Amino acid sequence: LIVVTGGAGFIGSHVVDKLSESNEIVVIDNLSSGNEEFVNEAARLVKADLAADDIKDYLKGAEEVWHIAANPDVRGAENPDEIYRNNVLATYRLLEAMRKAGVSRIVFTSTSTVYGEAKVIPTPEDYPTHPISLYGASKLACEALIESYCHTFDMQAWIYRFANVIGRRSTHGVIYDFIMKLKRNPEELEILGNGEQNKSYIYISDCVDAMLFGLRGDERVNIFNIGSEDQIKVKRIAEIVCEELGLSPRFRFTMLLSIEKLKRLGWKPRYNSEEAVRMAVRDLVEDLDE
Amino acid sequence: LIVVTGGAGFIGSHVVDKLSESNEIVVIDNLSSGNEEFVNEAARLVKADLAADDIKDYLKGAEEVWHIAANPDVRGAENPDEIYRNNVLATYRLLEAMRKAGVSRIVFTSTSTVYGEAKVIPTPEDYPTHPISLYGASKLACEALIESYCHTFDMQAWIYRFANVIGRRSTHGVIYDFIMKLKRNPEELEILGNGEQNKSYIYISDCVDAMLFGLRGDERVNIFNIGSEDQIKVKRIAEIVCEELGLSPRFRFTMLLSIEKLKRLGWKPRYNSEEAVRMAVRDLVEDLDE
Numbered sequence: 001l002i003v004v005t006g007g008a009g010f011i012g013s014h015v016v017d018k019l020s021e022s023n024e025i026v027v028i029d030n031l032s033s034g035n036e037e038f039v040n041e042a043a044r045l046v047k048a049d050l051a052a053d054d055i056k057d058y059l060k061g062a063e064e065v066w067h068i069a070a071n072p073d074v075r076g077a078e079n080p081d082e083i084y085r086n087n088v089l090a091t092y093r094l095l096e097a098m099r100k101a102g103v104s105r106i107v108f109t110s111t112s113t114v115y116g117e118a119k120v121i122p123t124p125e126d127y128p129t130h131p132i133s134l135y136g137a138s139k140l141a142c143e144a145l146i147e148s149y150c151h152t153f154d155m156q157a158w159i160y161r162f163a164n165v166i167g168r169r170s171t172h173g174v175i176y177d178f179i180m181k182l183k184r185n186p187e188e189l190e191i192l193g194n195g196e197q198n199k200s201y202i203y204i205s206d207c208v209d210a211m212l213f214g215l216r217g218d219e220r221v222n223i224f225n226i227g228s229e230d231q232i233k234v235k236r237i238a239e240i241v242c243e244e245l246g247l248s249p250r251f252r253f254t255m256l257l258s259i260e261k262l263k264r265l266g267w268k269p270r271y272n273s274e275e276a277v278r279m280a281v282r283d284l285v286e287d288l289d290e
Numbered sequence: 291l292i293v294v295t296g297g298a299g300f301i302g303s304h305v306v307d308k309l310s311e312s313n314e315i316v317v318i319d320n321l322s323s324g325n326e327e328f329v330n331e332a333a334r335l336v337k338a339d340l341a342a343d344d345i346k347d348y349l350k351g352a353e354e355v356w357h358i359a360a361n362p363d364v365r366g367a368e369n370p371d372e373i374y375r376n377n378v379l380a381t382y383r384l385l386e387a388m389r390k391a392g393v394s395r396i397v398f399t400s401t402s403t404v405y406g407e408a409k410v411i412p413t414p415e416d417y418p419t420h421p422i423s424l425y426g427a428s429k430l431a432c433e434a435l436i437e438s439y440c441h442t443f444d445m446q447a448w449i450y451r452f453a454n455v456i457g458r459r460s461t462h463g464v465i466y467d468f469i470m471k472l473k474r475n476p477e478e479l480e481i482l483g484n485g486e487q488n489k490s491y492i493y494i495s496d497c498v499d500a501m502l503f504g505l506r507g508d509e510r511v512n513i514f515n516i517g518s519e520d521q522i523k524v525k526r527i528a529e530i531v532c533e534e535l536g537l538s539p540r541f542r543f544t545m546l547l548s549i550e551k552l553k554r555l556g557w558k559p560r561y562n563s564e565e566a567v568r569m570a571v572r573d574l575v576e577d578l579d580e
C-alpha cells in the first residue's frame with residue numbers, strides 16, 4: 001500500500017504505472033496541473049488539496065508515501081504564494097498527516113536548483129545549498145522539514161534532486177517551444193542565442209528507474225542526484241525536432257549534477273541526452289493531438 | 291527607520307535598546323513570549339501577529355528589518371504547528387510584506403541547530419546543514435527563503451547562527467531552572483547525569499555586538515556563527531549559581547561553533563562562558579524581583 005501525491009501529473013503518473021504492477025496505489029491530487037486520464041486504472045484517485053484538506057484518513061495503513069506533488073516551476077513570472085502553498089505548506093501538512101497516521105517512509109522529488117549558483121560542475125550531493133530561486137528555496141525548505149521529521153518522529157527518507165525530465169505526458173520546455181513554432185511555421189525555426197547553449201535531459205523512464213534504485217540506500221536520510229551522462233546543445237535539439245517532424249526550416253538565431261553517487265551504488269541511465277530528446281519529441285507530437 | 295520583529299523579547303529588546311540610540315524604531319510583536327515592559331520607550335510598539343495580520347503600514351519607509359520574532363525552542367514537548375506558524379509562515383509573510391513595501395535589508399537570528407549533528411567542532415559556517423530538530427529545520431527553511439528573496443527581489447541579508455544566549459530579561463535556561471529548584475530546597479540541588487556536559491554560552495551584549503558588527507559583511511547574503519571562545523561544564527554552572535546565591539546545597543546527580551569568520555572581520559567576544567554565566571545569574575536574581 002503506497003500513496004503517491006501528484007500521481008496524476010507527468011512524473012507522478014509514471015511512478016504510479018510502475019508501482020501499480022505490484023502495490024495497491026492511492027493517489028492524492030487536486031488536478032491543478034495534472035490529468036486524471038493519466039492515472040493507472042489499478043489505482044484509487046483521491047481529489048484533495050495537500051495544502052488545505054485533511055488527508056490522514058487517505059494515508060491510513062500506507063507503508064510509504066511518494067511525495068511528487070508540487071507547484072509547476074516556471075521561468076520570471078512566478079507567484080510566491082502558490083509556490084509557498086503547494087511546496088512548503090503542502091509538504092508540512094503531509095508530514096503531519098504521515099506522523100498522525102503512522103506512515104514512516106517518504107520518497108521526495110526535490111530539484112537541482114537547491115544548489116543555487118554552484119561553482120563546481122558536475123555538482124555533487126555534498127555541495128553547499130544556497131538556492132537563489134524561490135522554487136529552489138521552497139524545495140530545500142521541504143528537504144529540511146523531511147529530514148527533521150525523520151529524526152524526530154522516526155521516519156526514513158529518499159530525496160532525489162534533478163533538473164529536466166522529459167517524456168510522454170510532459171508539455172513544456174525547449175522541445176515544446178520548438179514544436180509549437182514549427183506547427184506555426186514549418187519553414188522557419190527561431191532559436192534564442194546562437195544555439196551553442198548547452199542543456200542536459202534525463203528521460204522519464206530513467207528518472208523513475210533511478211528513484212526506484214536509490215531505495216536500496218539505507219541511511220535514515222538518503223539524498224541522490226539524478227541526471228544524464230551528458231549534455232546537448234540547443235542547436236542539436238532543434239535539428240532533432242526537425243528530423244522527427246521531417247522538416248528543413250531556415251534557422252533564425254537571435255546546472256549539471258554529478259550522478260557518481262548513484263552510479264557507485266550500481267545505477268546507470270539507459271539513455272543519453274540525444275536519445276532522451278528524440279524519444280520525447282515523438283511522444284510529444286502524439287500527445288498534442290491526443 | 292528600522293523595524294524589529296520580536297522586539298519585546300529577550301534578544302529583541304536589547305537590539306531595540308541599542309539601535310534606538312541612533313535610529314527610529316518600530317517594534318512588531320504579538321507579546322506572546324515577549325513583555326511590553328521590555329520595549330524601549332523611544333520605540334513604537336505595534337501589537338501584531340506576523341503569521342496573520344496586515345503589516346504593510348508598519349514597514350512603510352523602513353530601511354531594514356531585524357527579524358528576531360520566533361516560537362520558543364522547547365525541549366519532546368514541542369508543538370510542530372506552533373514552530374511552523376511562528377517561524378516558517380511568519381518569515382514567509384514578512385518577506386512578502388518587505389517585498390511589497392520596498393524594504394530590502396534583513397537581519398535574521400537563525401540557530402546553531404541548523405547543523406544537526408556536527409562532526410567538525412568548532413563548527414564552521416560552511417559545514418553541511420542537515421537539521422535533526424523541527425526547530426533547526428524551521429530555521430534552515432527560513433534561511434533558504436531569505437536567501438532566495440535576496441537574489442530574486444534584490445535584498446541583502448545578514449544571518450546569524452548561535453546558541454545559549456544568556457543575560458537580563460531571559461527566563462529560559464539552565465540557570466533559571468537551577469535558581470528555581472534551589473528556591474525550593476536550598477540544601478540539595480539535583481543535576482542531570484554526572485554533569486560533565488560542556489556548554490558554550492554567549493552573554494547577551496556579545497550576541498548583540500556581534501550582530502551589529504557583522505553588518506560590515508558585504509555579500510548579498512552574509513552568514514555568521516556567533517558564540518564565545520570556550521565552554522563550561524554543567525557542574526560548574528551549578529557552582530556559580532550557588533556562589534552567587536550564597537547557598538551550599540549538595541549536588542544530587544540524576545557543541546561549539548567557530549567564530550573565526552566574524553573574528554577575521556575584527557569582532558571578538560568580550561566575555562567567556564564563565565563570565566557570561568556569572569553575570570547572567572546576578573541578572574536573573576534581579577530579574578525575578580522586577
Ligand SMILES: NC(=O)c1ccc[n+]([C@@H]2O[C@H](COP(=O)([O-])OP(=O)(O)OC[C@H]3O[C@@H](n4cnc5c(N)ncnc54)[C@H](O)[C@@H]3O)[C@@H](O)[C@H]2O)c1
Pocket residue numbers: 005006007008009010011012028029030031032033034035048049050051067068069070071072073085086090109110111112162163164165166
Ligand atoms: N519535470 C521536471 O523536469 C522536474 C525537474 C525537477 C524537479 N521536478 C519535481 O518533480 C515533481 C513532479 O514534477 P512534474 O513535472 O511531474 O509536475 P506536474 O505538475 O506534472 O505534477 C505535479 C502534480 O502535483 C499536483 N499538485 C500540485 N499541488 C497540489 C496540492 N496542493 N495538492 C494536491 N496535488 C497537488 C498537480 O495537480 C500535478 O498533477 C515536483 O515536486 C517537481 O518540483 C520536476
Ligand SMILES: NC(=O)c1ccc[n+]([C@@H]2O[C@H](COP(=O)([O-])OP(=O)(O)OC[C@H]3O[C@@H](n4cnc5c(N)ncnc54)[C@H](O)[C@@H]3O)[C@@H](O)[C@H]2O)c1
Pocket residue numbers: 295296297298299300301302318319320321322323324325338339340341357358359360361362363375376380399400401402452453454455456
Ligand atoms: N536565546 C537563545 O539562546 C537563542 C538561541 C538560538 C536562536 N535564538 C533565536 O533568537 C531569536 C530571539 O530569541 P529570544 O530568546 O529572544 O526569544 P523570545 O521568545 O524572548 O523572543 C521572541 C519574540 O517573538 C515574538 N513573537 C513570536 N511569535 C510572533 C508572531 N507570530 N508575531 C509577532 N511576534 C511574535 C514574541 O512575543 C517574543 O517577544 C529567535 O528567532 C530565536 O529562534 C535564540
